[PDB]
Design an enzyme around this catalytic site. Structure first.
Site, PDB file in Angstrom:
ATOM      1  CG  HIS A   1      67.574  -8.738 107.071  1.00 34.64           C
ATOM      2  ND1 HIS A   1      66.852  -9.397 107.980  1.00 34.64           N
ATOM      3  CD2 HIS A   1      67.135  -9.039 105.855  1.00 34.64           C
ATOM      4  CE1 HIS A   1      65.808  -9.916 107.534  1.00 34.64           C
ATOM      5  NE2 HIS A   1      65.686  -9.796 106.192  1.00 34.64           N
TER       6      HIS A   1
ATOM      7  N   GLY B   1      89.332 -20.620  90.722  1.00 39.63           N
ATOM      8  CA  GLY B   1      89.697 -19.632  89.814  1.00 39.63           C
ATOM      9  C   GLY B   1      89.321 -19.976  88.316  1.00 39.63           C
TER      10      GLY B   1
ATOM     11  CG  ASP C   1      79.088 -20.309  96.274  1.00 41.06           C
ATOM     12  OD1 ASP C   1      79.108 -21.588  95.896  1.00 41.06           O
ATOM     13  OD2 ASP C   1      78.686 -19.317  95.690  1.00 41.06           O
TER      14      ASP C   1
ATOM     15  CB  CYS D   1      64.346 -11.675 110.771  1.00 42.76           C
ATOM     16  SG  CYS D   1      66.465 -11.593 110.718  1.00 42.76           S
TER      17      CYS D   1
ATOM     18  CG  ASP E   1      85.631 -21.401  92.474  1.00 46.06           C
ATOM     19  OD1 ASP E   1      84.751 -21.073  91.822  1.00 46.06           O
ATOM     20  OD2 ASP E   1      85.952 -22.906  92.440  1.00 46.06           O
TER      21      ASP E   1
ATOM     22  CB  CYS F   1      65.007  -7.673 112.159  1.00 44.74           C
ATOM     23  SG  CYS F   1      65.084  -7.704 110.802  1.00 44.74           S
TER      24      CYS F   1
ATOM     25  CB  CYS G   1      69.367 -10.431 112.208  1.00 47.88           C
ATOM     26  SG  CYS G   1      68.836  -8.777 111.273  1.00 47.88           S
TER      27      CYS G   1
END
Ligand code: NE8
Ligand code: NE8
Ligand code: ZN
Ligand code: ZN
EC number: 2.4.2.29
Lengths: 360, 360
Positions: free
Chosen positions: B327, B94, B258, B296, B92, B301, B298
């Site tokens: 997660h 700023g 984002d 999930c 970004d 999990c 991941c």
């Protein structure tokens, strides 16, 4: 594997290297055992703890009986399942971290702990190596007070033994270590050792050190105390310690170690290196592209610079704590590995000399 | 790969899925970009960020020009080397996180930032996607004030373009996105879009939202604003957002996102699940052996229960923050993957409907 088997593969002087076999795995000795204080080794997944070379971790009982609770962990399947560590776990008996109304029955505090309840909690947690419930005598201690405390600890050691043995599942699957007391006095250490050997344990800790006495005094006490313990059983020095303390204690016959220094001192910015500790927060590291230590094989030293970890710790970032802790625990495991190999090869006294020349 | 190439593979309504190719890798769109605020995605190693499926991360400029400094990161080899992330990085400009003496030249604050200096800093950091230096108009804004701010942003957008192009290394290896302003007013959004398209950019962000206006209002503004942007370039909605905001914005033509919510809201105890967010600190989870979310994929999990993560967060343990963040970022990546696949297969409107039925 058996419930418990300690085998000594090699010796040099008082130093020994070998293995402890237990149902959940093998423990290479001399051993460094990372500390969890709340069912976690701080800032590390267990797979990371293992990757650094740890064979066993220490479960911090005092914190667990309070948070999340022993009965609760048992209901959830035990500490191994709960935290995701399937290898051995040694638990302390709580008889240090509490010290409160003290009596011959045990201690009540701001809750109750007795030899029986301590052994039961370690059982609920699913501990592999159970520590006897002791009193860790304050330092300095007068001889009368050190003796009274030691004597009480030995009575508590017999109560621990009998509670453990009276629980069949625990007696068949776990191990029990007794803890020697006696402060810095040789005759009380000897009485303690005798009492413990008469009771009989799977392993013997030297307690009552690392309580502010200083390295010279600790080594002096170890010189006479460790030979009092059964040779053919593991010797655990509780709460030790710095890299240099570890080398000198192995030289004096200790097989097992726990310290909160590598975790603690890491999140604080202290990194261990073979040239001694550094404090990574120091401005001198702000543009230093080298790894924390020049020989270290850990993943942190493979991938990140001092300058980055400096930035992270300065910034209070959690990855800073994660990386410093991984490094420091890896450092300690690599130290243990160099100690084991040097004893096996009959060059540990040279290793110890070379280690100190460079570390200092 | 080319410096920059955006290709649309499939569409459904206003939604699109495709790829952005850049020298350091490919970015699958619609994309969720984890946020680093000090050269780290909080509590995660970059290898973990990647393992969750992230193709790009966002570098938080404002914090980096202060700590550790842009010139310093450049000296150390750039942000990619410094933090150990070798894939694209969007920075970004700023011009949000600062908002201080404001002028047509730029802003000074408690330091200076201008379009030229912002572009230079992003260059020093080694940014792959550079954001134009803008003014993010406060909400609510009167029409006059929104227009003045937008107009200044467009002047700054031309200065950004020309600073970027005037630096050959940057112009040849990085991309530049312009940012649309205009608050909630259609005519100012249109003027902004026109001005930006006339200048010409590699991608177009919708700025000035996620600034407290609420989902209905944000979606209303997106309805008319996103079609004003060049169709054949990526559309980035800055600062959005919750899972539900993401689905509705993709429905309105956004390609990139984002949010600090999955990181932020995770260390706070909020876990995303397909049945909606849970706060893992709630006592109801203290003995819940199920994973955070039932589907999930991941690693968190796979290995740990709600009950353990509950204990960790309650205890203030760093591994609690590490696991909740892994997660939540994995959840978000899996959301993006379900969005991409559903658009590719021409069933995204059904997905969005099914998602909402269950999430709420
Ligand atoms: N039971 C006991 N513990 C001690 C600890 C805690 C080690 C511990 C092991 C495992 C988990 C937590 C703490 C000591 N720490 C420093 N000096 C120490 C002495 C003793 C002692 O004499 N007895
Ligand atoms: N430049 C800019 N940034 C915004 C951010 C920060 C996103 C960001 C990206 C990458 C790193 C840090 C921050 C916003 N967050 C919420 N709403 C926002 C609006 C804007 C905006 O209009 N312009
Ligand atoms: Zn290392
Ligand atoms: Zn998960």
């Amino acid at each position: 594997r058996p419930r418990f088997s300690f085998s000594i593969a090699a010796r040099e002087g008082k130093a020994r290297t070998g293995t402890i076999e237990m149902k959940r795995g093998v423990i290479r000795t001399p051993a460094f055992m990372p500390v969890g204080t709340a069912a976690t080794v701080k800032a590390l997944k267990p797979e990371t703890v293992r990757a650094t070379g740890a064979d066993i971790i220490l479960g911090n009982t005092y914190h667990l009986m309070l948070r999340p609770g022993a009965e609760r962990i048992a209901k959830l399947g035990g500490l191994h399942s709960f935290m995701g560590w399937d290898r051995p776990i040694l638990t302390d008996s709580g008889g240090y971290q509490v010290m409160t109304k003290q009596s011959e029955e045990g201690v009540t505090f701001k809750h109750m702990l007795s030899p029986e309840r301590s052994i039961e909690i370690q059982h609920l947690l699913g501990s592999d190596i159970v520590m006897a419930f002791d009193e860790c005598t304050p330092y300095p201690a007068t001889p009368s007070r050190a003796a009274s405390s030691m004597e009480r600890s030995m009575r508590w050691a017999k109560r621990s033994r009998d509670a453990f043995d009276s629980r069949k599942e625990q007696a068949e699957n776990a191990a029990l270590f007794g803890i020697q007391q006696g402060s810095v006095f040789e005759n009380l250490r000897q009485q303690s050792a005798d009492a413990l050997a008469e009771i009989g344990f799977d392993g013997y800790a030297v307690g009552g050190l690392a309580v502010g006495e200083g390295q010279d005094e600790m080594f002096r006490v170890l010189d006479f105390s460790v030979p009092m313990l059964p040779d053919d059983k593991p010797h655990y020095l509780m709460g030790v310690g710095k890299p240099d303390d570890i080398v000198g204690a192995v030289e004096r016959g200790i097989d097992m170690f726990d310290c909160v220094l590598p975790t603690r001192s890491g999140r604080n910015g202290q990194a261990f290196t073979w040239d001694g500790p550094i404090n990574i927060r120091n401005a001198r590291f702000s543009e230093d592209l080298k790894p924390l230590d020049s020989e270290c094989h850990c993943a942190v030293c493979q991938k990140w610079s001092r300058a980055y970890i400096h930035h992270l710790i300065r910034a209070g970032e959690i990855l800073g704590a994660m990386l410093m802790t991984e490094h420091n625990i890896a450092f300690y495991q690599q130290l243990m590995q160099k100690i084991r190999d040097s004893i096996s090869e009959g060059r540990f006294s040279q290793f110890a000399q070379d280690f100190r020349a460079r570390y200092f």
